[PDB]
Amino acid sequence: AGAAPAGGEVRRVTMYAERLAGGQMGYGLEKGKASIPGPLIELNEGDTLHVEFENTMDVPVSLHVHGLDYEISSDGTKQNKSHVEPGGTRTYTWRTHEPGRRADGTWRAGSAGYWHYHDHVVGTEHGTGGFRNGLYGPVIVRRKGDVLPDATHTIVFNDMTINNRPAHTGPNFEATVGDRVEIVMITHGEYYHTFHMHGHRWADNRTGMLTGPDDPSQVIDNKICGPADSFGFQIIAGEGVGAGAWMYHCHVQSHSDMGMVGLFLVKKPDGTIPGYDP
Amino acid sequence: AGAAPAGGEVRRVTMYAERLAGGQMGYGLEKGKASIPGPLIELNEGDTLHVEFENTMDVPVSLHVHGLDYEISSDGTKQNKSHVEPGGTRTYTWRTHEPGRRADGTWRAGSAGYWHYHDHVVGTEHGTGGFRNGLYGPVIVRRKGDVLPDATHTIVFNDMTINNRPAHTGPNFEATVGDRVEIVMITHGEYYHTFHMHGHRWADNRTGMLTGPDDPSQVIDNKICGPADSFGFQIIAGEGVGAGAWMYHCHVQSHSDMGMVGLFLVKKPDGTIPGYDP
Amino acid sequence: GAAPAGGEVRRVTMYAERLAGGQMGYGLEKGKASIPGPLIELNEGDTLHVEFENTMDVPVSLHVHGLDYEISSDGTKQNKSHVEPGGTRTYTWRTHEPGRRADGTWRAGSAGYWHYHDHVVGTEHGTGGFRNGLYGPVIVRRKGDVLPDATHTIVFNDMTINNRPAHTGPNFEATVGDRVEIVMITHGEYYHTFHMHGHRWADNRTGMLTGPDDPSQVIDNKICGPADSFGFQIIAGEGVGAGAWMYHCHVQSHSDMGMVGLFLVKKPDGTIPGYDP
Ligand SMILES: [Cu+2]
Ligand SMILES: [Cu+2]
Ligand SMILES: [Cu+2]
Ligand SMILES: [Cu+2]
Ligand SMILES: [Cu+2]
Ligand SMILES: [Cu+2]
Ligand SMILES: [Cu+2]
Ligand SMILES: [Cu+2]
Ligand SMILES: [Cu+2]
Ligand SMILES: [Cu+2]
Ligand SMILES: [Cu+2]
Ligand SMILES: [Cu+2]
């Protein structure tokens, strides 16, 4: 699989917050193309990204990012007056840095991680109304040398939903046996959850893959997550287990009973899924 | 005594689902010997376990595992038609694999860990009723040269009970000062908990033990866990602290007040527990 | 600086005292009780004898996490190691360095971010002690650990921070570049997720990566439950500059209801751009 290059590029993007169907709100890279979750932002460690942000709505909104570097003027908080007025525009700047050695001899960790952005002013001073409506999205920051996936999928547990979807509507995600699939798992809102995958597992470290044979990270298929937690991993689809409709769910019993469920549809090369009704 | 060997043996076992008193249900290795939690299944990485499984109950049941490799047909789900009908039989196969380097140069995570099995059919299409009833049990998969303990105890925080026991009935576990004790700690149901042990601590990694002086893992005595979380560790009973009645409990305050307490009884070599006057 | 090897025997005096409005707290000097309790810092190898006085009219105890204590310093009713009202008792905490056992395994040492609390007030799990403020931090350093310019303790106790009224911080200030140690402890009934704008840390013992081979997750958001304890050291304003950097629980209803504070990081000229209450 491909390998992430060393960062250092200054990139520039427009992003738009727009109302969607049913009182929903989302970000998009171009006007009329807001989505929930918002578009995935992929950065190589050392990149800078300038986000020419526009709020097309009738209420204040913001863009705030976890993990990445930002001056206070890019917080996306009302307390700092770095939110965006109705119809307004503002340029947010996120930077990243590589790991390295400080002067005090100590080690400065790098920006690599599975991170996210969201709104910080819709509803409350903490964006409670924004998460509900869907103002959240993933950011991946890659380290030089990181393995690249064949497909990246974001699953957000926002209160009692997956991706603001109604219960028992997924979403489902498709791969072929052997595909290197990347999952981005963010939790928002009020409730704790446990993310669980049938038939697959990952390491509980930065990349979800053991570094080598001296990596002591626990290997799990089940992880407790809370509001604003984010992690990610990469799995070889159906490795050791074969093709099939592999179920993923929250393992909080009433949460999986009420529809916090989806399917990881792993197809054989020819396209059919063993033991599945399409 | 000693260390885990290399794996790869094909094993077979018989397993039954039976009713127990009080509307409870359990797994056992022989009829009339079901237990809550179910029997401890131990495997070495590479072993294959065929579970000749009989449902001696009048309602459907299934057998589902975390962490191990299994195909779709051994899912143990109503979904891909692998539950066991009342009075029916099924052979579930579980497989494990050693760590290795993939063709693409990535490091494939092995099966070794503290895992668990449970039903996916009683009550709801998830394990809900089965969990409340007691249909759950531990699986340990050891890697070559993992340190082997003198005794293994399973503690399941299932909803607001420890192993479906009444409030304030533990259970209690005995060891002698110096014993190498292994704890398997599983959680199920609806609530998060925080498992805590008095006078002992473990490392937050696969084994619960620091590999050596370069393992950076947290050293902890308190750990948040949610439904279907599982971890385990080994400790030396009494090490640096001496014999006595060492409390373990969930540390959610109302949880310990309403039953979620037990005792780790560490005896002196003469068998007495100092200061423990029941 | 860096922490030295341990070995020393330490003696300290502690009091459980009542506070205004039905609160309780621990103090090192009599009449100086506080919530959170005083910071206790040890080096691996050290022993601490805490001569302890209950200045109150109901029983109290002193229980610790992570450290080594024999049963007689358990601080529980079960082991009859609580302190009578008006009474005194010496609790002994021991620590140890890591080393290799006779059986060749590696014994993990005592170093870490730990805490002490009450275990008898209200119930035999100190539910009433936690409600009133009887908890505090304990830090145990490994030899060679990097020492901060400052340490601040943040206890999520139910839906309060350090038993404070909602929306009352606390705030903590530093100057850009300073080495700031946060101790973070949760108690009560609720899970929380502790988060900091502008800063991140490693999920390991020290909070910092040991080097380029450390695979720990680097995070700015950490779920935690009652009696969870952890710590980290950040460089104030590193890569992001001065400002009023919020920290808050991220469970949405807990941030909205007051579980919010400021990490006030100033420029060397003392200014904090954009900050105004
Ligand atoms: Cu859930
Ligand atoms: Cu499963
Ligand atoms: Cu399942
Ligand atoms: Cu946030
Ligand atoms: Cu509990
Ligand atoms: Cu304790
Ligand atoms: Cu499960
Ligand atoms: Cu306790
Ligand atoms: Cu909270
Ligand atoms: Cu934030
Ligand atoms: Cu925030
Ligand atoms: Cu405690």
Author numbering:
A (entry chain B), B (entry chain A): 40 to 317
C (entry chain C): 41 to 317
What did the original publication write about this model?
Laccases (benzenediol:oxygen oxidoreductases) are copper-containing enzymes that catalyze the oxidation of diverse compounds by molecular oxygen. The active center of laccases contains four copper ions: A blue (Cu1) mononuclear copper center (T1) and a trinuclear copper cluster (T2/T3); the latter consists of the mononuclear T2 copper ion (Cu2) and two T3 copper ions (Cu3α and Cu3β). T1 acts as a center for the reception of electrons from the reducing substrate, while the TNC serves as a binding site for the molecular oxygen and its reduction to water. Three-domain (3D) laccases are monomers consisting of three cupredoxin-type domains. two-domain (2D) laccases consist of two domains and exist as homotrimer, with the T2/T3 located at the interface of domain 2 and domain 1 of neighboring molecules, and T1 located near the surface of domain 2.
To assess the accessibility of TNC, we constructed and purified mutant variants of SgfSL by replacing the amino acids, His165 or Ile170, to either Phe or Ala. One of the proposed T3 tunnels is blocked by the Ile170. In the case of substitutions for phenylalanine (H165F and I170F), the tunnels were closed. Replacing Ile170 to alanine and phenylalanine result in a strong decrease in catalytic activity by an order of magnitude. We assumed that Ile170 is rather indirectly involved in the coordination of Cu3α ion within the TNC. Indeed, the detailed comparative analysis of the structures of the wild type SgfSL and its two mutant forms showed that Ile170 can affect (via hydrophobic interactions) the position and mobility of the His157, belonging to the 1st coordination sphere of the Cu3α. In our laccase structures, the Cu3α-Cu3β distance in the TNC varied by more than 1 Å, from 3.96 ± 0.10 ± 0.11 Å in the Ile170Phe to 5.24 ± 0.04 ± 0.08 Å in the wild type (the average value for monomers in an asymmetric unit with standard deviation and estimated maximum coordinate error). In case of the Ile170Phe replacement, the imidazole ring of His157 can be more strongly fixed than it is required for the enzyme functioning. Both replacements of Ile170, inhibit the reduction of oxygen to water, within the TNC and catalytic activity of SgfSL is decreased. Thus, the structure-function relationship was established for the second coordination sphere residue that explains the decreased activity of SgfSL with substitutions of the Ile170.
